[PDB]
A paper describes a structure:
Kivd, a thiamine diphosphate (ThDP)-dependent 2-keto acid decarboxylase, belongs to the pyruvate decarboxylase family and exhibits broad substrate specificity. Kivd, the key enzyme in this pathway, catalyzes the conversion of 2-ketoisovalerate into isobutyraldehyde, which has been identified as a bottleneck in IB production. The enzyme demonstrates the highest affinity for 2-ketoisovalerate, an intermediate in the biosynthesis of the branched-chain amino acid valine. KivdS286T is a key enzyme in the 2-keto acid pathway, catalyzing the conversion of 2-ketoisovalerate (KIV) and 2-ketoisocaproate (KIC) to isobutyaldehyde and isovaleraldehyde, respectively, in Synechocystis sp. PCC 6803 (Synechocystis).
The 2.8 Å X-ray crystal structure of KivdS286T reveals a tetrameric assembly composed of four polypeptide chains. The tetrameric structure is consistent with the results obtained from gel filtration chromatography, confirming that the crystal structure of KivdS286T represents the biologically active form of the protein. These regions include residues 181–187 in chains A and B, and residues 180–195 in chains C and D. In addition, residues from 456 to 477 and from 529 to 548 in the C-terminal region of chains C and D were not included in the model. Each KivdS286T monomer consists of three distinct domains. The enzyme’s active site is located at the interface between the PP and PYR domains of adjacent monomers. The ThDP cofactor, crucial for the decarboxylation reaction, is anchored within the active site through interactions with the conserved GDGX25-30NN motif, which coordinates with the diphosphate tail and an Mg2+ ion. Interestingly, the adjacent dimer lacks these cofactors.
Author numbering:
A (entry chain D): 1 to 181, 190 to 456, 477 to 528
B (entry chain C): 1 to 180, 186 to 342, 346 to 456, 477 to 528
Amino acid sequence: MYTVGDYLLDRLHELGIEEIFGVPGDYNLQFLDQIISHKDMKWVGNANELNASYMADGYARTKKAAAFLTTFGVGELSAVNGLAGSYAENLPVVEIVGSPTSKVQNEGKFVHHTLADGDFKHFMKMHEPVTAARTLLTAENATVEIDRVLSALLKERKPVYINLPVDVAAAKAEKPSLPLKSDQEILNKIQESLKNAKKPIVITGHEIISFGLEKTVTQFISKTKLPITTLNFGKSSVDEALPSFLGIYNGTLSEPNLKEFVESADFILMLGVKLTDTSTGAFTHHLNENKMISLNIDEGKIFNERIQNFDFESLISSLLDLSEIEYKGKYIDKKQEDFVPSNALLSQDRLWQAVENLTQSNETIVAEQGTSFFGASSIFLKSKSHFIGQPLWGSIGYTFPAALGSQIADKESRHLLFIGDGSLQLTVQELGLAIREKINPICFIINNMWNYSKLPESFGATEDRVVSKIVRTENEFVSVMKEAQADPNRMYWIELILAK
Amino acid sequence: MYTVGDYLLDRLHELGIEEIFGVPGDYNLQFLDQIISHKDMKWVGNANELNASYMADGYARTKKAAAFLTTFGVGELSAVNGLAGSYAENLPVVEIVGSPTSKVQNEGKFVHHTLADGDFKHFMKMHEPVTAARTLLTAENATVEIDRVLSALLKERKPVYINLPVDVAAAKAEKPSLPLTSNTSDQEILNKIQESLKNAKKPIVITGHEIISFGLEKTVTQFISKTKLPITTLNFGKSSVDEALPSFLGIYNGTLSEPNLKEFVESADFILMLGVKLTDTSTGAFTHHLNENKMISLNIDEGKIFNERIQNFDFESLISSLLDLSEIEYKGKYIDKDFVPSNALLSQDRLWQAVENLTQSNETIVAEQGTSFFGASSIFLKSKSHFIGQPLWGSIGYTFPAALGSQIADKESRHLLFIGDGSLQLTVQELGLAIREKINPICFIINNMWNYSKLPESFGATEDRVVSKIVRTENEFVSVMKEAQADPNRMYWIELILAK
């Protein structure tokens, strides 16, 4: 039989979701079965819900849609932080919440995972400010409601919430039938501005990643040869290997040449950007609104004139159909110091120098808030690479599960995680999943309270699965980097000890 | 100078809170210092916020008030699930949330830990359905607001929320001078209770969780002692009376109750229910038979005298008044109510038989949902003992941090934790705190896939701090139980392997 559960899963498939994360609970058991049954969908169960939500986030970053399952009350409220972070940084994550039978909910009984007030609507209400759409399904409204909220996900690429009562998931429903899903004036104004500019700057941001427009932007920048920079909030919204990519613009913390280039530009095109404290060097950015066109998901501005009505995705896509754009100016001077290692102990500055030099193409780099994010975000990535950081929401522990989710999202991109020992502790339990799912990320755990080196062994990993290293010197670092990248079939668990 | 922070902490001292849990964050650092400075208050920092909230809950259960500190956004939303569970089971927990300077909040800036919408009020709104009172402090309203919400905590003994902006915590304030009877229908009620009790040929007192909430356990025990009244508790409120009393019957849990108790309770001619809430898991899936027509029930918010609702009364002093009843003495019969180990492997039923026989006085027993809770809740505790279970909210992982919090709350009560391997994983990181704070609980981890045995060693414990055991047989169990109870200066990490 085809059921509501089936409908939801097929819909999720259409969004490109191939794995669902989460945690079994009594009110979501039956639907969990349905996920198993669907051959086009794989269940990847976490240790805890919060980890699940983080892992779905990372998955969304790469796969461009994600979903995870929790249980009413205890599950959903565990995940809320981190669904919040998916709202803040605009990732398309579906949260499915298995709830008691509608019979139980209507009778308002004091059942487990409630406040024994017979109210089944509190937790959805609590999810209001961190979801673009929500629904409590019924047998009648199910197909309509699923479609409504998944549509909102497509529109906004912000997380959405579906409360799925046991019996509603098992109820019959009819398959698919139909799939789910001022621009001209704007384009001309952009094109006119670009033809006129003697020194333009494109600045792209997180919302580009949200809609998986990275390749569009890259292709746009390539043909035009337009100067481009990103914020750290949206690092990799363009291929950093392009010759017209300047580096990261981050207020007065920007490298001086980039800073001067950006802030002396005669035209600014900002795409999918939000200026936050940590992404603008504590608001020390100088982006004159009078010579700037900015486009975002929800709104945009043409030279201080707000625009309301447009389609963000296709408006960006249209940048490719512009014409007679070619930048003939200079850029900024880069640097070509090779990392030559010694037996010197590894320092922070040397680490990132080495990472930049040794990183390869087709890699995703994930960096946790703290020394790791600060160092890693300034790196120029290799061609066809990606970056995951969470500098707006800034939830510690995030990058570990996120890294794993992302790695699962794209097996073809080798993930390199940079996380501090302090932070890793908060989400370390997902090491279990890493071992089970036989995924192969390169994990660097920077030191500075437990002995993490021998953690894989504790979780039941052998040397055929995880390789554990300790690095103290430059030579050791180089060696282990190359060794790790040379072996795509094992996960690497590398403890860095940094000097001074 | 004396500050708002100081005010809050002095107020917290008056509630009897001697330790504050939580996690440092940039928006709560300065206030954290204030906790350190206060000699009558000790900071006990957790690994994660969720753990903190669970640990505060456990602390409240024993100390009868608790507090923990988180950081705006990421911190508070991490803890929300534990706070929800504190609301559900009615524990007096203060959540303090350090937030950005009021200057920043008013200017509505896109700072870290926000949704970059310049709204600072979302997260408090999300806490609405799980707090009895909430406040965003200002320099002006601080003393009033602190007192308002801490008063509500006193009234309802449900959790409360204080958002504390950096600058507001540092703002000048005066030491509190004043410290923190509703109706005379209390007198009528007492007489009706007394009249009913004198007349009853077979009365039953049933006490519940709300008794623990107000620390009325000793009152109830003294009441039952003088009168010799038959008493039973639900598992939702186990230990709301001293189970060692001769008139304590056991646990009433619907048709899952021991037959004699079941028949006693359900054939009673008068029922006095104090602080009771009937949930699915605490009745036998609602197989309780408590005739409302021969029953007086008192709760925090409301009560019923033979199907006549009362609204306005003081729960605490109304219970306290039960002691001033007179010419109450039960003259009736009660119900009818020893472990020899072998080399036989340890089974579930044998475990709890052994625990019941070997448990000592002045102990707290903490049991996680699943097998542990089912077995442990049926035990008769020794004199002056306590029980922690969370059968309403039923959040897995809870009992580990909760156990630790409770243990910190009362150093004089030896905690015995019974948790499943599955659940321990969710909150295991707090093992760090256990080692640091040099507390000495007896932890039984039922094994039912990582190597937990070597966990203390990982977290830096030596044999002088934690003793690690593996138990398979009955003899081994008895031996390790006695050995653990015989050594009050070390924590015990005991892995139970159960049979079929």
